[PDB]
Amino acid sequence: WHRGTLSLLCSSCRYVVRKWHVPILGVDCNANPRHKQALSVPAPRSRGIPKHLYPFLVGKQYPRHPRWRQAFTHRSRMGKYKPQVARN
Amino acid sequence: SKEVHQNVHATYAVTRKPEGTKMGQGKGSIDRFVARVPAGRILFHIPQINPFHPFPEVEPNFAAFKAIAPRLPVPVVFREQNNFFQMHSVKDLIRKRQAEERENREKTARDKLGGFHTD
Amino acid sequence: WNRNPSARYPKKGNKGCRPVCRAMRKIRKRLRTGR
Amino acid sequence: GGSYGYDAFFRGAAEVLNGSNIQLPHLPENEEQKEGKVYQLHSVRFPPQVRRLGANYFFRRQRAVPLTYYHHLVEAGVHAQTGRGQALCFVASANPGYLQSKELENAVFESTRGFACQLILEGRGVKAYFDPEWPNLMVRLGVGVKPLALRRLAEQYATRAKIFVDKRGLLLTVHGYDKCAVGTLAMSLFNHLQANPYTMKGAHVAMHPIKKKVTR
Amino acid sequence: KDVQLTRLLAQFPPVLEAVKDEKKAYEEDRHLRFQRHARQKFETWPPEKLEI
Amino acid sequence: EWSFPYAWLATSLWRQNIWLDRKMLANLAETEPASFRALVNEGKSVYFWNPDKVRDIQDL
Amino acid sequence: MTTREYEEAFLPRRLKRIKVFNTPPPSELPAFFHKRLDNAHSNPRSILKLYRQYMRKDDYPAYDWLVRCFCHLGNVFGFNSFWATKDKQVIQALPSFKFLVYDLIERKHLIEARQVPRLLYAFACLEYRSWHLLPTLLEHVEANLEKWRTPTLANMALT
Amino acid sequence: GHKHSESVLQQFYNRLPVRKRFLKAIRKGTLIWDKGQVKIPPIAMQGYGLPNKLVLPHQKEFNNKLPKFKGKINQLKATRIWFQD
Amino acid sequence: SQSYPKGSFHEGHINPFADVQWISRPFMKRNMPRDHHPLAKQHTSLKAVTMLDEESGNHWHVLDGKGRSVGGLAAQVVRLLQGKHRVDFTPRTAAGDSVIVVNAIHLKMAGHTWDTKVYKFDRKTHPAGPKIITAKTIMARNPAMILNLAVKRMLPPNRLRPIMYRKLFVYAGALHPHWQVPQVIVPAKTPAEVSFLPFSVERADPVQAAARIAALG
Amino acid sequence: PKYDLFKPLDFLACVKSVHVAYHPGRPRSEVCRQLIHHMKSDSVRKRFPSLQASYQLLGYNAPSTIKIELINGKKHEFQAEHFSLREMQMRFDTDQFEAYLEYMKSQSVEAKP
Amino acid sequence: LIALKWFRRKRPPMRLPKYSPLSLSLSIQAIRGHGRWGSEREFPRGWDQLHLKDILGSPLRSE
Amino acid sequence: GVLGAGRSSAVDVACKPWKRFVRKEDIQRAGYVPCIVEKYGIERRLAIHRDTLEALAFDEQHGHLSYLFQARLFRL
RNA sequence: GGACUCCUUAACUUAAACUGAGGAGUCAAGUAGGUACAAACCGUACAAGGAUUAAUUAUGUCCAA
RNA sequence: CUAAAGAUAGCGUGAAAGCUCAAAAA
RNA sequence: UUUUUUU
RNA sequence: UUUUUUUUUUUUUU
RNA sequence: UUUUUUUUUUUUUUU
């Protein structure tokens, strides 16, 4: 009875390991042969996220470059609009 | 016999492109309704209070929530808050009494042999 | 699923976390923030 | 290694904290063994056979707490025995668990009496007779079926274990000095002597009968 | 160390007999032989006895 | 060769007010073995410093 | 909110970290360590670490403190304790213990009469014998033969 | 091979100098590749805490306080167990 | 013939709760290399020996790779082969010295490498693809190859690689067939004498010894 | 599955008769009481019905004594004040296993009274 | 010969020892007066702590 | 009785000063909870140990911020 | 009546290198360096010209180096 | 020996019988 | 040139 | 731990 | 428990 997980269903179940083609876990039951479970058909694994990208993933991500051109511009800073400036 | 209550209601509407529409010909018709459930919001709760105060050795019951947590599209965590305080605990008193009895016993045993003076 | 094209290869060390033509950067953040 | 999984990243691995406290196989372990335990040094007197273990098991083997060992050797109706005039070994330790290892008892049993096992035979016409003399074992598996030559096993296990059969031929006893060998032999025998659940014609290890079945 | 210990032991030659605590076994079956890589024989078609 | 890595050597030299380019260093290393050894010995003295107290535990 | 990693990702990697808590340092090393010794009485590692810290902080620690630390280390391996002789041998085979005994030997001349019984008891407990201090201790014992109490005389004879 | 384009995850697997037997296993999920070695995937037990190497930096403080298992697989008494993704 | 090979994990415990879940060996327990019981004389290994020659200018380095790591050994060998250890190193030419390796069979490999490692050999326009050969076969047939390939893949990818490769000598056995070169392993010598006896022998009373012997007899 | 072939033998297994004689209140007298209670247990009564057990209380200060006779005619005598339940069994384990071996050979262990 | 420095054996010294939780737990139990022989508080056993403290703290007599 | 109305509920804990040029984040990372005290007096800054504060805050094994937390008399 | 990326956001299947907005960098019109392999990412005391010289930067320090 | 033992938690049969667990003692 | 395990 | 080992097992807990 | 990561260009894991 291949299953994607393992659980203790009997009163005397024991988590063992079978020497199959590959090391595979399993559950053996003495009072019921039907409860014999073998974890050999799991779900496909996903592609994990690298650790080094953690800093730039979680938390408030502020803009890299700030905005200053809109707050920097002035008539005095332009030769075409400087003469029109009047302090009187 | 038990009572339950819901804390989230489906009111946000969402549209979907009908099968047979071009790239862009305006917004599609309403498809279904969803509820914007942010993190930390409660979904279901049972006001029922654990009556078994002098029995802290038993964990709560969450079979009902276990039966539906796989269904939900979000990870859920069980919770159970009560009015039970530390000060009002019998564990402390039991501990105290055990300590006292131990001490008493020890004292008695030392005094019996007479290896040391009394008082 | 999003796994064939080159706009989804993670940044490795010394790239700035935003190389040319990336989508997964903004996908994961969005996902976490709400899907 | 260095890669977060989707479950632990997004979901945060919340499944482990989504289990119920009901329909459990076993009751929770009582949290009684709290602060206030007083340890003491226990000592046991074992027969002089454990000397065969040597220092490699008592000193070389690493352990959490020290494991001392001493050998009290003494020069040599009713068996009126006392605590004096005989040899023995003192094994003392602070952990009672170390004073109950199966190896210590095996060191004595292997060189004193050894081990044994039994197999019971059942079924109509099932008989386990003997050839002219050892080593030649034949077992008949029902009426009309040819016997099974079991000489291979006996030759394999010669001088390590021996097989005995009662007059009736319904019991297969195995006697040996090696635990492993004995067990292996027994199970080897039972592998081809296993009984059918329907006809119930074969062999079985004692205290483990097979359940009967019927067709619908 | 081995040299020095051998020299020390050379000065105390054995006097009494040694005592052994080896494993007990059925010595009677010493003359038996076991063949591993032994093929199964089929002399005759109808088998009178099954050879495992 | 003389059990003195470049890593150490560089530091040792610089700490000494020594201003010798890698070109001359390398040329010396090949043409003037003795000269090079002199430099290495000079550097080692500075690099390797003893503490204020020395303890002997040979007989203990 | 923001994460520490995020913040740190835009600063030199070798940049030092600010201090959150600052308190005055201990003015008197002997008085500072005497109070610390009051808590370590069962853990040999704590005693050894305290001695190492004092040795690193000062080149000539207090002789009374050194004697007290040696007695504290010796007391742990008592006769009624469950410790083994291998644990005493490996302890004797440590460099820090050799440094402590060397420090005691250097200024052995500052040994008081009342500190001899404790040194002998520690020697008996640790099964460690020296020809560097025992000859001096015996001189004091014989000199003050006519002043020791009966229990001390018996314990010294047994040791 | 004949396929023109392949997934990066598949490609990665394709580059593993191992036997077919282990390749299949790896593909399936019964086995993992890490540090140039193949080992059994981590085991997630019900109620017990997961390894500190798999949780997020901010989750380690809470993970360390959970119960831990210091026994063998035979002695394990977990109601349910599965591989940690 | 009809089933998968018997791995090393088939003969031991399995511990999933650990880094080294199962130990792996090139051969079975009953198949591991061993020495003949009748030693005609005892031998001792010199670790490494070196021969200089000013006239011909060809230097030799004989090493003992007994219980050493393949990677480390390879790494070390590479240095010598390249000749980077000398002051007068010229990348254009091969400034290295001849290297001899013995006891290659005794090498070790950490992790599950003996049972989960293979080697690929490219084929020019072959439908079947590259030929795959397991490491157990290579160990069985020619152990030296294990080190040889590691060194080869370590050496720079240039036209000098063959040259550098040629000078390398690896043997599974103890001794070598070379004529004019010292042996790493030489017959053992008599231990040095000691100027002191670490024993204190004290005989007992002959009468009591005889009485005890008679009682025991 | 996992079959249990070997099983430890009970203290009262293959025993013909047992006799106990001790003085209540004597130091190191727990063995006697434990043995008595074991002998007069329920499990014992069911597993070994043909067992002859008896205890005596001495009216004077005297050392404890335990006498055990097996089915094969072997006899043993021990002091409760210098031994334990566990230690005692190791002294006569050989004869007990000899008798059990003979019984095993001769008959099946699954028999019932 | 210097070239072959990698082949040299080395053994650093032991900075500090290592002990198990039970080994450390037994030490405080012994110090508190629960040694192997018995309870010092219940009965004064040999090499006790209180007697040693007094005799070694007041060894000299009063003039 | 145990459940009597004549029972005190006050707590007494120590605090640490808030150093100059110190952020909330720094303190938080250090293993402390920053706090301030503000009415009927000058504004004071303190830091309370996490393991000490959280223990009072979350006085249940399967609970969140308790109601009682805001119903006490802290003697800082 | 513009191609990639950062923050906010409209549309879409919280899809797509699309479709369209608000404000910073780069390319367009940028060299050499790093990121394995082909503008957009990091860094630059950023390419008038010549020579066998010294430096805290992204970042590295088992081998290819 | 004393103490304790759910209207009955897990096996079993044809309506039964029988075993085990909890509790108690050690 | 590995660390930790209060009293 | 024993060539016990196609999906079958023993011993010892390392 | 830690040093060893997407080191996923190759070798190697020598701790």
Side-chain angles (χ1 to χ4, degrees):
Chain A
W1 184 27
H2 300 99
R3 272 226 289 167
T5 56
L6 304 168
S7 308
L8 299 168
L9 305 174
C10 319
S11 62
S12 314
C13 272
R14 296 178 172 157
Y15 285 117
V16 296
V17 66
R18 305 187 176 81
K19 311 186 295 194
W20 299 1
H21 68 122
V22 301
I24 299 152
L25 320 176
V27 184
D28 178 30
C29 187
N30 281 319
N32 199 336
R34 292 195 183 192
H35 268 178
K36 295 172 180 177
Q37 294 155 75
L39 173 49
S40 312
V41 193
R45 292 188 139 284
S46 67
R47 190 183 72 163
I49 307 155
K51 283 183 183 168
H52 69 270
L53 303 173
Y54 175 83
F56 316 102
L57 278 169
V58 73
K60 189 170 185 169
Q61 301 284 306
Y62 285 87
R64 301 298 193 80
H65 303 106
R67 298 178 188 84
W68 68 276
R69 295 199 177 285
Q70 278 197 315
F72 194 82
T73 61
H74 204 251
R75 282 197 298 171
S76 59
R77 301 171 165 150
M78 306 180 186
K80 191 171 183 170
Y81 303 104
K82 175 167 175 174
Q84 287 97 73
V85 178
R87 290 178 67 166
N88 300 303
Chain B
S1 58
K2 308 300 185 183
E3 179 166 290
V4 294
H5 293 283
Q6 186 172 348
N7 200 58
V8 282
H9 324 322
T11 51
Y12 207 86
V14 54
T15 68
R16 191 189 206 87
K17 281 284 186 172
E19 191 178 296
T21 316
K22 73 184 199 184
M23 195 68 176
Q25 205 135 244
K27 195 154 190 163
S29 60
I30 300 151
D31 177 34
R32 81 207 95 84
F33 300 100
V34 282
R36 311 202 296 175
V37 192
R41 182 65 62 248
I42 307 176
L43 298 162
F44 298 131
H45 63 280
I46 318 155
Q48 187 65 58
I49 304 154
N50 189 1
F52 299 10
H53 178 238
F55 300 90
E57 314 199 338
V58 68
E59 291 198 358
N61 163 57
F62 298 123
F65 305 145
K66 192 184 177 187
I68 50 160
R71 314 277 88 220
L72 306 171
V74 292
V76 302
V77 63
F78 308 146
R79 279 195 179 171
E80 183 173 276
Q81 180 160 11
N82 318 280
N83 298 350
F84 311 145
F85 314 121
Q86 300 167 2
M87 61 189 172
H88 301 152
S89 180
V90 188
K91 199 176 180 180
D92 309 75
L93 294 160
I94 291 161
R95 193 178 59 267
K96 291 183 179 190
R97 185 61 174 170
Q98 286 177 3
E100 195 181 61
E101 285 178 0
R102 181 161 52 268
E103 191 182 334
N104 289 351
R105 284 173 292 170
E106 288 180 15
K107 191 177 185 177
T108 56
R110 196 209 78 156
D111 287 354
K112 198 154 181 175
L113 288 160
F116 306 94
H117 284 307
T118 53
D119 317 272
Chain C
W1 271 87
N2 52 4
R3 218 58 43 84
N4 281 24
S6 299
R8 312 197 133 83
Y9 301 164
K11 164 255 182 179
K12 68 162 69 163
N14 193 344
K15 205 95 174 180
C17 201
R18 54 182 200 162
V20 314
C21 305
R22 293 301 313 289
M24 303 299 294
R25 307 314 309 157
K26 69 162 173 293
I27 288 282
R28 263 57 151 88
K29 294 174 285 188
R30 200 140 59 99
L31 212 173
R32 259 186 301 84
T33 320
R35 197 181 195 176
Chain D
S3 306
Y4 302 121
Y6 277 27
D7 194 49
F9 200 86
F10 302 101
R11 283 148 273 157
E15 289 197 63
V16 54
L17 299 177
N18 291 352
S20 63
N21 315 298
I22 324 160
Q23 293 179 356
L24 310 163
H26 326 281
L27 285 163
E29 199 81 312
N30 197 28
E31 203 158 38
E32 192 276 337
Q33 196 164 220
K34 74 193 178 184
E35 191 63 279
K37 190 176 181 177
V38 180
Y39 290 88
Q40 295 202 290
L41 189 81
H42 307 282
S43 59
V44 177
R45 290 171 284 177
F46 288 87
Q49 277 72 17
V50 302
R51 146 171 55 147
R52 203 189 71 162
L53 286 163
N56 294 335
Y57 167 77
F58 288 110
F59 302 121
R60 288 208 183 286
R61 283 201 183 178
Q62 304 294 307
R63 275 172 276 276
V65 293
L67 177 63
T68 191
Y69 156 77
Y70 286 99
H71 181 42
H72 188 264
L73 178 61
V74 177
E75 186 175 49
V78 67
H79 289 289
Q81 296 178 0
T82 56
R84 313 180 210 75
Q86 287 196 0
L88 57 101
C89 291
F90 290 99
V91 185
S93 193
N95 197 330
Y98 295 172
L99 308 176
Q100 299 196 312
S101 158
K102 286 181 182 177
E103 192 156 27
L104 285 153
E105 308 195 331
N106 292 352
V108 193
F109 300 147
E110 173 166 313
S111 182
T112 44
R113 46 180 193 76
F115 325 87
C117 189
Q118 185 175 240
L119 311 163
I120 306 152
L121 323 174
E122 57 189 36
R124 187 180 178 194
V126 190
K127 192 178 176 180
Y129 62 90
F130 260 116
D131 258 346
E133 285 205 311
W134 179 259
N136 296 296
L137 181 66
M138 306 201 77
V139 179
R140 197 184 62 206
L141 188 57
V143 191
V145 184
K146 312 299 184 176
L148 284 150
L150 305 160
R151 176 164 173 157
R152 190 175 178 77
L153 298 154
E155 284 181 335
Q156 183 169 12
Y157 297 92
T159 73
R160 297 183 286 161
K162 189 167 181 176
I163 298 159
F164 306 86
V165 200
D166 79 323
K167 297 190 293 186
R168 307 169 297 185
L170 274 57
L171 312 161
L172 315 169
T173 324
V174 198
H175 179 263
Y177 307 97
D178 202 354
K179 215 168 186 179
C180 195
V182 173
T184 55
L185 181 51
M187 297 301 291
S188 297
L189 295 159
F190 175 57
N191 183 45
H192 269 241
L193 306 169
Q194 194 173 17
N196 189 293
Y198 295 105
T199 60
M200 312 212 76
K201 311 288 188 70
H204 62 89
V205 68
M207 293 173 167
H208 291 87
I210 306 103
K211 196 172 187 181
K212 193 169 183 178
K213 277 199 172 188
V214 294
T215 54
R216 301 196 185 201
Chain E
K1 284 171 181 180
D2 291 358
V3 175
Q4 295 288 344
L5 189 61
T6 311
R7 282 179 182 169
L8 173 58
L9 288 167
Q11 300 175 47
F12 291 109
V15 183
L16 296 164
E17 195 173 11
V19 65
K20 299 182 182 178
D21 294 313
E22 68 189 335
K23 197 213 212 91
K24 201 186 287 190
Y26 290 96
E27 308 191 55
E28 314 96 310
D29 295 326
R30 284 174 168 285
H31 67 277
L32 305 181
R33 191 165 55 202
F34 167 63
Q35 294 186 329
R36 203 163 205 151
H37 319 110
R39 287 192 164 289
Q40 297 156 321
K41 306 179 183 179
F42 304 92
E43 306 189 41
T44 60
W45 165 228
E48 300 282 57
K49 65 190 183 184
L50 227 36
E51 200 168 321
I52 191 162
Chain F
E1 189 175 25
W2 303 103
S3 66
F4 216 63
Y6 169 80
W8 306 348
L9 186 57
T11 55
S12 59
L13 294 162
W14 294 335
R15 294 165 182 285
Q16 288 169 312
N17 202 11
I18 307 156
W19 311 109
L20 297 163
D21 52 14
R22 297 160 177 77
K23 193 193 171 187
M24 292 294 106
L25 291 158
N27 182 29
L28 296 167
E30 198 194 358
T31 61
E32 319 296 342
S35 310
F36 195 83
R37 190 180 74 84
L39 291 154
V40 177
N41 285 346
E42 213 71 13
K44 275 185 177 183
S45 70
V46 170
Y47 191 74
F48 306 116
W49 90 97
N50 305 304
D52 294 339
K53 186 168 178 65
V54 193
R55 297 177 180 75
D56 192 358
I57 50 172
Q58 281 288 104
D59 65 328
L60 269 56
Chain G
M1 306 193 76
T2 186
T3 60
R4 189 186 67 195
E5 292 67 29
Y6 179 72
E7 297 192 314
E8 296 191 338
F10 307 98
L11 305 162
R13 56 161 174 164
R14 269 169 278 210
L15 201 71
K16 80 196 194 171
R17 294 176 179 154
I18 59 157
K19 204 157 178 172
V20 72
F21 294 125
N22 271 85
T23 51
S27 181
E28 294 195 338
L29 261 55
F32 172 73
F33 280 105
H34 269 92
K35 265 198 172 185
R36 292 195 73 153
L37 259 175
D38 289 347
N39 294 317
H41 281 97
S42 193
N43 198 337
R45 190 184 291 92
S46 304
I47 295 151
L48 289 168
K49 279 178 165 185
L50 201 75
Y51 164 69
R52 194 175 295 192
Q53 288 175 17
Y54 202 173
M55 176 260 186
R56 276 191 171 200
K57 285 197 178 189
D58 201 342
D59 286 341
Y60 298 105
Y63 205 77
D64 170 82
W65 192 94
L66 294 167
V67 176
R68 186 170 147 164
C69 180
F70 190 84
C71 299
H72 274 51
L73 188 73
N75 188 71
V76 188
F77 298 94
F79 293 85
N80 294 351
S81 199
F82 301 92
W83 281 116
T85 184
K86 176 169 170 189
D87 297 309
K88 308 179 195 186
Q89 295 182 304
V90 296
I91 289 281
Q92 288 174 12
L94 291 163
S96 58
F97 176 85
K98 293 180 177 187
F99 303 149
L100 175 61
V101 67
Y102 181 89
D103 293 340
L104 290 169
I105 290 155
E106 188 180 50
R107 294 179 290 165
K108 68 194 182 182
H109 67 87
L110 301 171
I111 290 280
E112 300 295 338
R114 66 192 185 182
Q115 294 168 339
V116 170
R118 300 227 78 148
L119 289 160
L120 292 164
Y121 170 72
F123 284 16
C125 289
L126 280 161
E127 300 174 48
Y128 177 69
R129 195 204 287 164
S130 72
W131 55 276
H132 293 103
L133 296 159
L134 191 66
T136 54
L137 301 168
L138 302 182
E139 293 292 341
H140 287 286
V141 175
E142 189 169 30
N144 295 282
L145 177 63
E146 295 202 334
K147 301 182 181 179
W148 303 121
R149 298 163 61 202
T150 64
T152 54
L153 291 162
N155 195 21
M156 276 175 155
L158 179 57
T159 50
Chain H
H2 295 83
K3 287 195 170 191
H4 179 214
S5 187
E6 271 278 29
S7 179
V8 177
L9 189 67
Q10 309 295 318
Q11 290 176 31
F12 167 59
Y13 305 130
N14 296 344
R15 300 200 304 278
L16 308 170
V18 283
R19 309 183 178 197
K20 296 174 177 179
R21 205 162 72 272
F22 292 101
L23 286 163
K24 289 186 184 175
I26 298 155
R27 287 192 190 87
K28 282 200 176 188
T30 64
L31 299 167
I32 54 159
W33 184 273
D34 181 40
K35 294 180 185 175
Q37 293 294 315
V38 50
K39 319 180 198 168
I40 312 155
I43 306 154
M45 296 166 283
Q46 193 74 228
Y48 297 93
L50 296 167
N52 225 45
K53 71 188 187 179
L54 309 182
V55 297
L56 309 172
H58 62 267
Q59 292 194 29
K60 295 182 188 178
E61 188 179 349
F62 301 102
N63 182 60
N64 198 31
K65 297 176 196 175
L66 298 169
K68 303 179 187 179
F69 184 62
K70 308 179 185 179
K72 305 298 189 189
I73 188 164
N74 293 290
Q75 296 169 347
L76 177 58
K77 305 289 180 189
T79 54
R80 196 169 72 82
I81 54 173
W82 66 98
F83 298 122
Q84 186 60 30
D85 189 16
Chain I
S1 57
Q2 206 160 25
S3 188
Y4 55 80
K6 308 298 187 189
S8 311
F9 66 90
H10 289 273
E11 306 214 295
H13 310 104
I14 303 150
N15 189 15
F17 311 108
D19 291 343
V20 48
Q21 303 165 324
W22 43 276
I23 295 158
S24 69
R25 300 180 192 79
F27 323 98
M28 287 193 163
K29 280 170 263 183
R30 68 178 186 286
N31 299 334
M32 285 290 281
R34 293 188 302 89
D35 307 343
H36 205 217
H37 194 202
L39 298 172
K41 57 189 181 186
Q42 274 282 23
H43 293 71
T44 310
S45 185
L46 308 169
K47 308 293 181 187
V49 182
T50 58
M51 190 167 74
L52 185 137
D53 179 14
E54 298 186 334
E55 193 181 80
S56 77
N58 178 235
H59 311 151
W60 291 86
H61 300 74
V62 197
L63 276 47
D64 176 33
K66 196 170 188 175
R68 299 196 166 290
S69 169
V70 174
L73 195 59
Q76 292 295 313
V77 171
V78 170
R79 194 172 172 271
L80 304 167
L81 293 165
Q82 291 193 282
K84 293 189 180 174
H85 75 106
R86 295 166 61 161
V87 70
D88 63 352
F89 166 62
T90 49
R92 302 205 307 155
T93 64
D97 308 301
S98 303
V99 184
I100 303 151
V101 197
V102 295
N103 294 319
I105 200 168
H106 291 104
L107 291 164
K108 287 185 170 180
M109 288 196 192
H112 313 151
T113 312
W114 286 121
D115 287 287
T116 90
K117 184 150 187 150
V118 296
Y119 293 90
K120 306 184 188 173
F121 299 97
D122 301 15
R123 296 188 281 189
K124 191 171 176 176
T125 315
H126 205 280
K131 191 73 172 180
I132 312 180
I133 305 295
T134 62
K136 292 207 184 183
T137 70
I138 298 169
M139 273 294 285
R141 298 185 175 200
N142 198 0
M145 288 294 289
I146 303 299
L147 199 66
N148 296 332
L149 295 165
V151 174
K152 193 205 174 190
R153 287 162 178 182
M154 280 190 207
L155 286 161
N158 55 24
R159 296 197 156 185
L160 303 154
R161 178 160 65 180
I163 299 156
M164 296 171 188
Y165 196 58
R166 182 56 167 72
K167 291 189 184 184
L168 188 60
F169 309 86
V170 196
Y171 307 91
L175 274 67
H176 53 248
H178 296 274
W179 303 324
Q180 290 203 350
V181 68
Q183 303 278 342
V184 72
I185 291 139
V186 282
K189 295 184 179 182
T190 320
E193 290 287 357
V194 185
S195 64
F196 57 85
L197 290 94
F199 317 120
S200 171
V201 189
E202 224 167 69
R203 294 183 182 279
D205 200 315
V207 190
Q208 297 180 331
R212 189 175 186 273
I213 288 158
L216 288 159
Chain J
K2 178 154 179 178
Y3 300 94
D4 197 350
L5 274 67
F6 316 111
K7 279 284 201 194
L9 293 165
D10 202 343
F11 190 88
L12 306 166
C14 305
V15 180
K16 188 171 171 192
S17 71
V18 180
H19 189 249
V20 195
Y22 90 111
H23 181 229
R26 193 178 168 75
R28 297 180 167 164
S29 58
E30 186 173 26
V31 179
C32 312
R33 189 173 172 274
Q34 286 182 5
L35 185 53
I36 301 150
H37 290 183
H38 192 205
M39 289 199 305
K40 299 203 177 198
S41 189
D42 306 335
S43 71
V44 67
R45 285 185 159 185
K46 277 187 176 178
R47 284 183 295 158
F48 309 126
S50 193
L51 193 67
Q52 298 182 39
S54 65
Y55 83 101
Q56 188 177 359
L57 312 169
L58 268 68
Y60 51 94
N61 194 6
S64 326
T65 306
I66 302 155
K67 305 173 188 181
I68 291 158
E69 183 175 343
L70 302 175
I71 56 165
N72 63 351
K74 298 287 187 174
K75 294 179 182 186
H76 291 84
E77 177 172 19
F78 310 111
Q79 288 165 336
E81 71 197 55
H82 294 307
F83 301 90
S84 76
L85 303 169
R86 193 184 176 197
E87 290 181 10
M88 286 191 292
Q89 198 179 4
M90 295 171 175
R91 312 304 183 201
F92 60 89
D93 180 56
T94 304
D95 308 301
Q96 196 187 38
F97 190 83
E98 279 182 4
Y100 180 70
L101 190 64
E102 284 190 24
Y103 180 82
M104 207 176 204
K105 287 177 187 178
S106 56
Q107 300 187 18
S108 178
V109 304
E110 294 195 315
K112 299 288 183 183
Chain K
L1 192 71
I2 300 152
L4 299 172
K5 199 171 184 176
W6 182 84
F7 299 79
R8 192 177 183 74
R9 200 188 192 179
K10 293 188 286 171
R11 302 185 297 171
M14 185 182 288
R15 285 183 172 189
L16 273 161
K18 293 188 186 186
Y19 304 118
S20 86
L22 186 60
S23 314
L24 295 175
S25 182
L26 293 172
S27 299
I28 195 77
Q29 186 184 309
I31 290 282
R32 284 172 173 164
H34 280 275
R36 62 186 166 191
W37 275 102
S39 187
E40 292 170 33
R41 307 191 199 194
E42 187 173 310
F43 205 84
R45 262 80 174 191
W47 296 103
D48 60 304
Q49 299 289 339
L50 302 171
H51 183 224
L52 289 175
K53 187 177 178 181
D54 287 3
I55 66 186
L56 307 173
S58 190
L60 290 165
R61 289 171 56 187
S62 63
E63 187 167 20
Chain L
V2 185
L3 309 165
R7 197 165 178 197
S8 79
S9 72
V11 305
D12 193 357
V13 285
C15 314
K16 287 191 172 182
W18 197 329
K19 281 214 289 155
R20 204 178 181 198
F21 304 106
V22 177
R23 312 174 296 166
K24 290 179 287 179
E25 285 67 31
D26 310 314
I27 298 156
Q28 292 167 355
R29 298 157 187 164
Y32 295 75
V33 186
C35 303
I36 66 102
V37 196
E38 51 152 23
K39 198 172 184 172
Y40 302 125
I42 56 163
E43 187 183 308
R44 270 208 176 79
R45 299 199 184 168
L46 307 169
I48 308 160
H49 201 237
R50 261 211 297 274
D51 296 349
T52 318
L53 203 71
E54 299 184 346
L56 305 167
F58 316 94
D59 70 329
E60 294 187 36
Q61 198 178 247
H62 305 286
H64 215 241
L65 188 68
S66 186
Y67 288 103
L68 188 55
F69 182 72
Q70 302 180 86
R72 330 197 71 164
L73 198 80
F74 293 74
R75 277 156 174 161
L76 307 183

